[PDB]
Hints:
One of its GO terms (molecular function) is protein serine kinase activity. The chain is an alpha+beta fold.
Amino acid sequence: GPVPSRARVYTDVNTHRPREYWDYESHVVEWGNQDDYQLVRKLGRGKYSEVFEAINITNNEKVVVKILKPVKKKKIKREIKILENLRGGPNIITLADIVKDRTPALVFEHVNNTDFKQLYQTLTDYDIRFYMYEILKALDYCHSMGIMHRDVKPHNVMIDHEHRKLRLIDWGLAEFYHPGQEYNVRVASRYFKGPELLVDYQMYDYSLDMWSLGCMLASMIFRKEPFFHGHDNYDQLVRIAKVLGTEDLYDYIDKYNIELDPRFNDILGRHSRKRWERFVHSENQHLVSPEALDFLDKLLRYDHQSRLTAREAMEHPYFYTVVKDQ
Ligand SMILES: CC(=O)Nc1ccc2ccn(-c3cc(NC4CC4)n4ncc(C#N)c4n3)c2c1
């Protein structure tokens, strides 16, 4: 069987908490009053919800309402408990209310989000460093609180650019970290899935989020969205291997005694590790620095144990100007 793994940091944060902190199956949902909100317009669909802008008629606040499609009680309880545990944490979306009427609806703080397809193409070198640092504050916080996001991606990072305001949203896939637990690998968007998910290594941890973050950083500095563009989950690992190289991949598989799907055998092939420089062009060079590439290299690792922690990432030279300015 596969060799076990433990998070390097925040390993036992939940084991030290009272049971109720992480035992979300026992959680009793506190329902607010549905009549306090009126929907204004549809914002879009998720996997298991439709999202609206609304008004709290009680206080004239703009809010966001996520009306749940049918999902198991325990999955709703998990997201609620996590949002409550993290509330007040840096750049974590605030869950403001939970209502019903027999469908449950989560009510969030509204972020005046700048279009992800527009905003990203205006960002300067400084902006990317600044917003990356803001995401790292949210990830260090949630990790320190015993929670993996497991769905870090551009769509789940709301930025009100005028106010330099960022929030990490959509904690619907997040889970509590418990050492030894075998997690579901069927999480995250294709392009952002960590190698652990793609090879079916279940004993993963907070470090998953750091891979996803590295994918975001690469797509921003190189202006290549998505960065790792797979055709499916199998081809996704191939796309990663054509950049990181196959030697390190097979080293990771050996170290954890992972059983690789036989399918993969015929498709991974043999690939050198590429230098980052092949992704730099006249369009993106203003975003790309030695610091950026050093930081990126230390997030995008097969071996989850070798990736930077959120807290370590915050100390990287890439952020020195940002840290001084704050
Ligand atoms: C709520 C959730 O987890 N899922 C989700 C899924 C789809 C959409 C589509 C739009 N949203 C938004 C749009 C904006 N702001 C307005 C300017 C566009 N915000 N501001 C704050 C949240 C939250 N939470 C939000 N959500 C979604 C959220």
